[PDB]
Amino acid sequence: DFRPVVFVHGLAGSAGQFESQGMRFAANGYPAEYVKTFEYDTISWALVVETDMLFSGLGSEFGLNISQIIDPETLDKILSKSRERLIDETFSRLDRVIDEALAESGADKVDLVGHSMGTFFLVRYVNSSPERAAKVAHLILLDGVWGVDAPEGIPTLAVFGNPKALPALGLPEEKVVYNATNVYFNNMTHVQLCTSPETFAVMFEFINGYKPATTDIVPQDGDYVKVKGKFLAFATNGDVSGWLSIYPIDENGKRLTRLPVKFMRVKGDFEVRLRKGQLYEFQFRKDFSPIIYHYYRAPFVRDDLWARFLVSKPPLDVELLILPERLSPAAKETSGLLLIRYKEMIGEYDEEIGGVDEVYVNGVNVCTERICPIERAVNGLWVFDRGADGKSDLDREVVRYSIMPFMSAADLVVPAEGTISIAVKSRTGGEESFTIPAWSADRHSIIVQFSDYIVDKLAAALEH
Ligand SMILES: [Mg+2]
Ligand SMILES: [Mg+2]
Ligand SMILES: [Mg+2]
């Protein structure tokens, strides 16, 4: 019998970094409900908690950077929170999740997995009391804390990627969690490490004692899948209110039904039954905003209980960064996109990584060495007409994003006429392409989520 696994994301992260992994666990026999995700406000956590000296402030670095855009009065309110109180509140909520999971499954202990800042969070959590540590069969720490001992008596696995994808003004000649089994994937980058099928295999074997029969997201039988998802605020992860309209679409992004096949008021959570292998447009209207959001992604092939749709909201309203252009005349005639992949898009070649991604928008590669260098760990690439001047200047950095963790931007004019072609040729092999309507930036925002792994028949065969 499998025991539940509970995943704790990092700064500016969410359940999305464990979506693929949850589906791999289920493909290998785990009831899908046994894979839990614990979400929390990462801005308050990084600034209030991880700025202490337990780890000499290491767990807070990306939070310090991303916080630059917070309004002064709001920042002060955030920093005024009691640190001991935030900790006890958040940790008590994880106790509840773990206790409910043990009762639901009948298991005696759970496996806990943390990514990046989530590893700092979990080391504090298990060391906070013997009762908390007692409920953990295995602890997995992905590309986060290092130079510390594994919590006493808890079998710990630490998996590390290439440090070039993280801030390097520090000098770790090696990252090790003492007394843990340490595994290294030097050809992988920060978030990629969290979502990789190779990481999946190492984790499954560590906690189960045998290699999984497959690391593929195996499609399930039948024509329908259950999807449980949430619309939540980027980085702070609070539930977001709005209206969800789902439309099945063709290969060119045209809606196949006049009316949406699902229409609902949402407050964070939502659950829907959809057709397996079908392309959908998830249209979202958030309360109090005039923009209509159109979310695109590959079809679902099995139940997915961890889908996440990110929404820009205060205090960290990152979308405000593209407001000047959205308010310009060119917005009526040009589109604005956010391309997301939880596996760094890399345009700079490094022999250790071994290859570069190519990301084409209307036939132009925006994943260049200047826009997607390895050190920026690009998981979110904003594509819009910077300056609203009708000129593409890919060689000139879009400076406003330089300090934003995991994001970059490309100044490319995308005509809001007809459709937009978007394709990624993955550095690890395979390609995924989308053709969608060219919604104008004045009224619409377009979010395209690339899959974090592509299994290509020919490439797999060539390797075999
Ligand atoms: Mg064991
Ligand atoms: Mg059938
Ligand atoms: Mg421009």
Nearest to 242 by CA among 268, 217, 220, 262: 268
**What residue spans of 367-412 are helical by DSSP H?**
none
Contact yes or no for 302/248 (Cβ under 8 A): no
3-class SS string, 18-36 = HHHHHHHHHHCCCCHHHEE
Using the mean position of ligand 1's atoms as its centre, give its distance from the Cα of residue 21 in Å.
Answer: 19
Ligand number with the minimum distance to the CA of 392: 3
Beta bridge partners of 231: 309
With residue 293 as reference, give the H or E element that holds it.
strand 292-297
The CATH architecture annotation of domain 312-464 reads Sandwich (2.60)
Nearest to 336 by CA among 290, 291, 295, 382: 382
Residue 411, annotated as binding a ligand: yes
31-36 contact pairs (CB < 8 A, 24+):
31/2, 31/105, 32/303, 32/305, 33/104, 33/305, 34/2, 34/3, 34/4, 34/5, 34/101, 34/105, 35/4, 35/5, 35/7, 35/305, 35/306, 36/4, 36/5, 36/6, 36/7, 36/97, 36/101
Cα 82 from chain centre: 28
Nearest to 414 by CA among 346, 366, 344, 358: 366
Number of residues that make up the chain: 464
Dist. CA 214–CA 426, nearest whole Å: 21
Using the mean position of ligand 3's atoms as its centre, give its distance from the Cα of residue 385 in Å.
Answer: 4
Contact yes or no for 238/316 (Cβ under 8 A): no
Using the mean position of ligand 3's atoms as its centre, give its distance from the Cα of residue 330 in Å.
Answer: 10
Using the mean position of ligand 1's atoms as its centre, give its distance from the Cα of residue 150 in Å.
Answer: 14
Cα 165 from chain centre: 16
Nearest to 41 by CA among 316, 270, 308, 447: 316
- 269-275 and 224-233: which strand pairing? antiparallel
Resolution in A: 1.8
| CA distances to 81, 191, 204 from 124, in Å | 18, 22, 24
Contact yes or no for 109/136 (Cβ under 8 A): yes
Dist. CA 68–CA 64, nearest whole Å: 7
Ligand number with the minimum distance to the CA of 411: 3
DSSP per-residue letters across 256-270 = SSSS-SEEEEEESEE
- 241-248 and 224-233: which strand pairing? unpaired
Name the segment(s) of the chain with CATH classification 3.40.50.1820.
1-217
Residue 391, annotated as binding a ligand: yes
Using the mean position of ligand 2's atoms as its centre, give its distance from the Cα of residue 249 in Å.
Answer: 22
Residue 221, annotated as binding a ligand: no
Ligand number with the minimum distance to the CA of 221: 2
Residue 109, annotated as binding a ligand: no
Contact yes or no for 139/126 (Cβ under 8 A): yes
Ligand number with the minimum distance to the CA of 384: 3
Name the segment(s) of the chain with CATH classification 2.60.40.2200.
312-464
Q: Starting from the edge strand earliest in sequence, which strands make up the sheet with 156-160, in order?
A: 35-38, 5-8, 110-115, 136-142, 156-160, 181-184
Ligand number with the minimum distance to the CA of 206: 1
Using the mean position of ligand 1's atoms as its centre, give its distance from the Cα of residue 138 in Å.
Answer: 7
Dist. CA 13–CA 379, nearest whole Å: 11
Residue 226, annotated as binding a ligand: no
Ligand number with the minimum distance to the CA of 222: 2
Residue 272 dihedral angles phi and psi, to the nearest 5°: -145, 155
Using the mean position of ligand 1's atoms as its centre, give its distance from the Cα of residue 139 in Å.
Answer: 10
Dist. CA 110–CA 25, nearest whole Å: 14
End-to-end CA distance of the chain: 33
Residue 386, annotated as binding a ligand: yes
- Name the experiment that determined this structure: X-ray
Using the mean position of ligand 3's atoms as its centre, give its distance from the Cα of residue 383 in Å.
Answer: 10
Residues 6+ apart with CB under 8 A from 115: 7, 8, 9, 10, 13, 17, 18, 142, 143, 144, 191, 194
Dist. CA 289–CA 440, nearest whole Å: 16
DSSP per-residue letters across 199-250 = HHHHHHHHHHSS--S--S-PPPSSSEEEEEEEEEETTT--B-EEEEEEEEB-
Using the mean position of ligand 1's atoms as its centre, give its distance from the Cα of residue 27 in Å.
Answer: 21
**Residue ranges with CB less than 5 Å from ion ligand 3:** 385-387, 389, 391, 411
Q: Which letter, b or e, does each residue of 143-157 get, where b requires 16 or more Cβ atoms within 10 Å of its Cβ?
A: bbbbebebbeebbbb
CATH match for 218-311 among 2.60.40.2190, 3.40.1280.10, 1.10.274.10, 2.60.300.12: 2.60.40.2190
Using the mean position of ligand 2's atoms as its centre, give its distance from the Cα of residue 222 in Å.
Answer: 5
Name the segment(s) of the chain with CATH classification 2.60.40.2190.
218-311
With residue 74 as reference, give the H or E element that holds it.
helix 72-79
Residue 192's Cβ-count burial label (10 Å; 0-12, 13-18, 19+) is buried
Using the mean position of ligand 1's atoms as its centre, give its distance from the Cα of residue 210 in Å.
Answer: 10
Using the mean position of ligand 3's atoms as its centre, give its distance from the Cα of residue 410 in Å.
Answer: 9
Contact yes or no for 355/349 (Cβ under 8 A): yes
Dist. CA 389–CA 329, nearest whole Å: 9
106 CB neighbour count, 10 Å cutoff: 8
Q: Which letter, b or e, does each residue of 313-339 get, where b requires 16 or more Cβ atoms within 10 Å of its Cβ?
A: bebbbbbebbeebbebebbebbbbbbb
Contact yes or no for 8/237 (Cβ under 8 A): no
Contact yes or no for 197/203 (Cβ under 8 A): no
The pair of three-digit structure tokens given for residue 28, joined into one six-digit string? 């290998």
Dist. CA 133–CA 146, nearest whole Å: 19
Ligand number with the minimum distance to the CA of 223: 2
**Proportion of the chain in helix, strand, coil states, percent, rounded to 5:** 30, 30, 40
- 337-345 and 378-384: which strand pairing? antiparallel
Cα 155 from chain centre: 27
| CA distances to 11, 95, 135, 140 from 126, in Å | 19, 11, 9, 12
Fold exhibited by the domain 1-217: Rossmann fold (3.40.50)
CA angle, residues 76, 81, 84, in degrees to nearest 5 = 150
